[PDB]
Design a binder for this molecule. Structure first.
Ligand SMILES: Nc1ncnc2c1ncn2[C@@H]1O[C@H](COP(=O)(O)OP(=O)(O)OP(=O)(O)O)[C@@H](O)[C@H]1O
Ligand SMILES: Nc1ncnc2c1ncn2[C@@H]1O[C@H](COP(=O)(O)OP(=O)(O)O)[C@@H](O)[C@H]1O
Ligand SMILES: [Mg+2]
Ligand SMILES: [Mg+2]
Lengths: 50, 421, 542, 141, 53
């Protein structure tokens, strides 16, 4: 039991590092898209006035 | 300043005088070999040929890459996206295609030769110079034009260099010959066009790209076609290259060119650092137009090859890594490793297709299962060296492994000295 | 002569402004430019004031000068409609592009029609069986309804719409109208050759027995042509619906390209952009297009429209606006395709108005809702299975995961149009076979059979006939040792007699590309035009 | 239909017609509220009336804001929904109860129009798409 | 909010009293200033509020 839990928790660290690595890239894409869309909104507001 | 009009829509020199010449994005040569002599000017913005002007893609364009010509076969007149991260071997596949067109051009008649155009958009000038030295020292510059809008050039030149190269290749398409154009880093053309659009104060869309950034690549890639018999019968094959960030192929320009081209060559960044080169993502990369335009014999073995690599990815990286190992499906693991190491291939060495179908015949029919996985790359060159060269000529002329040929091939494949083991 | 003739004021891409000094055309009225290299048809979009209209060109504007005479046609874009359009390919402005002569027009209709009124609406929810398992089970298609195939560039909404053409339009009794909006020209040529070969398009004298009209505005066309070619397809379909009284099929590949072409021309019309970069008039343009496709009291149109999501974003405004116009959405997913499941239909994102127990019967409805419940319970467990494995699930949940992994292989199906690149023959599946199969997988009748026995099979019979072949084959590890001996002198000569009977081809050096070549003389100095128009070199001043 | 009025500005209609149709329906429903009867008003797809208002104001060249909506798109729904009241006995005692509908995108409740109309209305009825496919119909969160 | 505040400021300064000023949703002050700031000729700030927030 102890030696199989030692391997199952290694598999869980591997899976929760893989999931975290994909979710970090997803967050970075969402962050980049967020600054881009907020900046495009500010430029579209300023180009209607200037 | 005084601005004079020239009286002509934006044109580049097209013709047989462009072969061997390095060019910028506007038509004037930069290799220092004087002006273009045996040439004439045509427009860079041509409407693509219509529906009647085309015919179905029948003939195969051999890349010379084993992983490409077996799993994603590419016909003449196709558009095949080469997509992947930075330093995953996209340019290597493209220049293996150009070198292999040089290698096959000396063995076909002149109506079946392929004249290449390499458009380098946003590259370094040093890598373009090294690539010109490569195409000169491999003899491939005789059939190759190179358009070069580098990173130092103005962004209108990087925007227009794919259209310039496409007109230079549309000469070969329209005159009944066969063309092969490679838009290397077509993402950089969309970056240059985004620069031109934002400096023109046009309202940006997704990822600050203009609204007509799909039209930018569809104009370019619809000109790669296979013309009908009443238009000379010529063809133009496009190899657009799109670079992805962290393997995100759901990006804007990536999914634009995926929804334009016929198939894809996904080059995975994980397999490129595990030594598997070319790092072809076999699960994602398709080619559904040159699937009918495949060399038979390679169509006889490569379907079984792709099926066995499909059922190899049912135990992919959980052989005993996750929980357990079966040891009845040890065979699919120790055969998929052989089929993987069979498809690895070093750079600047493209293979004729008759020497690829024999290698995948030896890898698939079971002539290499007792070879260790560390020496299958030596076993392949030992098979190609030790089997007599008559079977290569018979398979190249007949165009299929005949029932008269597979017996002699299994005869010549059981008397080869596979090293080690 | 000077009346009804304006001149080009300014050329901004596909947007041309024309100044009419005498009298201005109406909005949506078509104009024609005199002296162009092609037939350049403009369509008036705005009145800008100062006697100037603002138009949208149906072809390219390269070569336009700001003095060119522009003739008002006095009408919108009129295209030929009728039974004489059957078997013909026509572009956005009704010109025959199939090189089969002029189109024998029964009439010429304006491509801008008002939508049919509220009193001319037909509310008849009748099912249309397609032979696709996931479509007939989880989101069935209405017989006279609007159908969307939402997809993300490579997930298979062209293969799905080709299979719907293969399955539905052959069993249909009316006329089909394929509108190609912004798709590949190779795909239009492939569909033309397949429809000529299969006999639904006939050439020459038997052209009247052709049952399909193709209207093609593909992605090589400028954004003015891709913005109005759906209207041409609608006009050809609306003539069959209204005047002919027929039941029409209308397949529109990539109705997104209409929206994208309007957003391309909208930046040069001088508008402030809306959300993520589209035109402010997205919803009203899409509504004015999609409300013309209606099963009325005098005819029905079964519309199947492929919709493209731009970066696998269903929250993008152009598919999110399209979602409210359709009776049955079939959302194809990238992840389902990456599992190898084809058609890659998301079962928990595709919906239909026909999935109602009072219209398709309670048995079919209860089976579809049970399959969706098992798939939703598996999707709830997708994170525990990933980060912990299946060994930590409950015994009731491992059964849920097993039945869900069976039903999500069983939703996949081979297609008759995909058999050319997959090798497996296609499967048409009747509706009762789908309900009878998914009843058996829901109740637990097939917990014996493995998960891959459900993958890419037709019905529940073929699951059992594949689990037989999967267990004959593991018993076929020890069947025989195959060897063919004393064979070489039966019918096969040798290695060297074969190389003597091949026909080696002749090769030629110095390829000779100077045959039929013009070779004009490009001099060194760049040639410009002086003020009298002569082709002179540049002056020596900078 | 004996007790129901239907105000229908469809997708083929102009943007000011879809902008004005909730106000037309509220004015038709205020007759019952002001004459002592009790009314029920359903503004189906209020997130499409906001989109029609966005188009109508962007083509009037007013400066855009969050997701290119007008700045006063809160006032658009607040002055509409505040007309649903329960009057005093000296005004008849009549009532009007509103059921505005907002469509969210992938369950994003933090959208602009969604958060505005949540801050305007009294209650909320959340319909999740994961409760819908688990058999729970209506999918009340 | 300025009207409620000047009633409280009269009750604080002139009457000298100790005042309670309950303000329900002071967010709507900034929201109401945001709805007019594009029409006052101000280019927008961060997420969509006025530059003078
Ligand atoms: N089949 C191969 N075998 C061995 N090495 C290879 C192979 N293909 C490429 N390489 C090496 O890996 C590197 C990949 O460079 P390459 O230009 O092919 O990638 P790329 O995707 O074009 O990168 P970038 O876009 O950044 O130029 C090169 O240095 C090349 O020498
Ligand atoms: N039913 C199917 N069977 C097998 N392969 C499919 C199927 N549907 C799609 N594919 C694969 O997915 C790709 C989808 O291409 P396409 O049909 O053009 O979709 P899209 O128009 O969305 O790009 C094809 O290359 C094909 O290989
Ligand atoms: Mg490169
Ligand atoms: Mg498509």
């Amino acid at each position: 039991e102890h030696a199989s839990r030692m391997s199952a928790m290694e598999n869980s660290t591997k899976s929760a590092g893989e999931m975290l690595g994909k979710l970090t890239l997803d967050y970075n894409r969402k962050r980049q898209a967020t600054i881009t869309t907020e900046l495009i909104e500010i430029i579209a507001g300023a180009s209607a006035l200037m | 300043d005084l601005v004079y009009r020239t009286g002509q829509i934006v044109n580049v020199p097209i013709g047989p005088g462009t072969l061997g010449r390095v060019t910028d994005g506007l038509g004037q040569p930069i290799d220092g070999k004087g002006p273009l002599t045996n040439v004439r000017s045509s427009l860079v913005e041509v409407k693509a040929p219509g529906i009647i002007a085309r015919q179905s893609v029948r003939e195969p364009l051999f890349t010379g890459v084993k992983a490409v010509d077996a799993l994603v076969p590419i016909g003449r007149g196709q558009r095949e996206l080469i997509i992947g991260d930075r330093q995953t071997g996209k340019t290597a596949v493209a220049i293996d295609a150009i070198i292999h067109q040089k290698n096959c051009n000396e063995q076909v008649p002149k109506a079946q030769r392929v004249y290449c155009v390499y458009v380098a958009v946003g590259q370094k000038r040093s890598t373009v110079a090294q690539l010109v030295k490569l195409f000169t020292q491999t003899g491939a510059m005789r059939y190759t034009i190179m358009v070069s809008a580098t990173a130092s050039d103005a962004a209108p030149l990087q925007f227009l260099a794919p259209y310039s190269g496409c007109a230079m290749a549309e000469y070969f398409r329209d005159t009944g010959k066969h063309g092969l154009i490679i838009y290397d880093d077509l993402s950089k053309q969309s970056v240059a066009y985004r620069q031109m659009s934002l400096l023109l104060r046009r309202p940006p869309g997704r990822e600050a790209f203009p609204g007509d950034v799909f039209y930018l690549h569809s104009r370019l890639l619809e000109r790669a076609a296979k013309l009908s018999k009443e238009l000379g019968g010529g063809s133009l094959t496009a190899f657009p290259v799109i670079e992805t960030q962290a393997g995100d192929v759901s990006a804007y320009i990536a999914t634009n060119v995926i929804s334009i081209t016929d198939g894809q060559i996904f080059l995975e960044t994980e397999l490129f650092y595990k030594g598997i080169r070319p790092a072809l993502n076999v699960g994602l990369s398709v080619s559904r137009v040159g699937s009918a335009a495949q060399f038979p014999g390679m169509k006889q073995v490569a379907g079984t090859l792709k099926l066995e690599l499909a059922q190899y990815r049912e135990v992919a990286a959980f052989a005993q890594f996750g929980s357990d190992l079966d040891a009845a499906t040890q065979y699919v693991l120790e055969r998929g490793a052989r089929l993987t190491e069979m498809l690895k291939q070093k750079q600047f060495a493209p293979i004729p297709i008759e020497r690829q179908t024999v290698a995948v015949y030896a890898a698939t029919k079971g002539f290499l299962d007792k070879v260790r996985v560390q020496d299958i790359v030596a076993a392949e060159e030992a098979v190609i060296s030790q089997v007599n060269p008559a079977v290569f000529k018979i398979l190249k002329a007949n165009g299929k492994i005949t029932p008269a040929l597979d017996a002699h091939l299994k005869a010549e494949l059981r008397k080869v000295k596979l090293p080690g083991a | 002569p000077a009346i009804d003739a304006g001149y080009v004021s300014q050329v901004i891409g596909p947007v041309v402004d024309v100044r009419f000094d005498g009298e201005l055309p109406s909005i949506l009225s078509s104009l024609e430019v005199e002296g162009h290299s092609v037939r350049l048809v403009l369509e008036v979009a705005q009145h800008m004031g100062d006697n100037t209209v603002r138009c949208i060109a149906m072809d390219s504007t390269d070569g336009l000068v700001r003095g060119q005479k522009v003739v008002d046609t006095g009408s919108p874009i009129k295209v030929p409609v009728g039974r004489g359009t059957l078997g013909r390919i026509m572009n956005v402005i009704g010109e025959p592009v199939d090189e089969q002569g002029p189109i024998d027009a029964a009439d010429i209709w304006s491509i801008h029609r008002e939508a049919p009124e509220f009193t001319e609406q037909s509310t008849e929810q009748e099912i249309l069986v397609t032979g696709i398992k996931v479509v007939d089970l989880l989101a069935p298609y209405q017989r006279g309804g609007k159908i969307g195939l939402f997809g993300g560039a490579g997930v298979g909404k062209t293969v799905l719409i080709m299979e719907l053409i293969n399955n539905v339009a052959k069993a249909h009794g009316g006329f089909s109208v394929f509108a190609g909006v912004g798709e590949r020209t190779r795909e239009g040529n492939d569909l033309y050759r397949e429809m000529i070969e299969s006999g639904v398009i006939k050439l020459g004298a038997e052209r009247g027995n052709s049952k399909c009209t193709l209207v093609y505005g593909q992605m090589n066309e400028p954004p003015g042509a891709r913005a109005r070619v759906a209207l041409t397809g609608l006009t050809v379909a609306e003539y069959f619906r209204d005047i002919e009284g027929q039941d029409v099929l209308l397949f529109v590949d990539n109705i997104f390209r209409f929206t994208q072409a309007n957003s391309e021309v909208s930046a040069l019309l001088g508008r402030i952009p809306s959300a993520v970069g589209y035109q402010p008039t997205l919803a009203t343009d899409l509504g004015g297009l999609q409300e013309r496709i209606t099963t009325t009291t005098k005819g029905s149109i079964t519309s199947v429209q492929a919709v493209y999501v731009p970066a696998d974003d269903l929250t993008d405004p152009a598919p999110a606006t399209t979602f409210a116009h359709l009776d049955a959405t079939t959302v194809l997913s990238r992840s389902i395709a990456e599992l190898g499941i084809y058609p890659a239909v998301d079962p928990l994102d595709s919906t239909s108005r026909m999935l109602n127990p009072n219209v398709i019967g309670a048995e079919h409805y209860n089976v579809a809702r049970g399959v969706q419940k098992v798939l939703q319970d598996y999707k709830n467990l997708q994170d525990i299975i990933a980060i912990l494995g299946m060994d930590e699930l409950s015994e009731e949940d491992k059964l849920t995961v097993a039945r869900a992994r069976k039903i999500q292989r069983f939703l996949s199906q081979p297609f008759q149009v995909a058999e050319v690149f997959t090798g497996t023959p296609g499967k048409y599946v009747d509706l009762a076979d789908t309900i009878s199969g998914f009843q058996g997988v829901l109740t637990g009748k097939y917990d014996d059979l493995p998960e891959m026995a459900f993958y890419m099979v037709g019905d529940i019979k073929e699951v059992k006939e594949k689990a037989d072949k999967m267990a004959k084959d593991i018993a076929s590890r020890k069947e025989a040792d195959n060897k063919k001996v004393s064979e070489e002198l039966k019918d096969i000569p040798s290695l060297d007699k074969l190389v003597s009977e091949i026909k080696e081809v002749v090769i030629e050096e110095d390829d000779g590309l100077e045959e039929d070549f013009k070779a004009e003389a490009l001099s060194s100095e760049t040639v410009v035009l002086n003020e009298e128009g002569k082709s002179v070199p540049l002056p020596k001043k900078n």
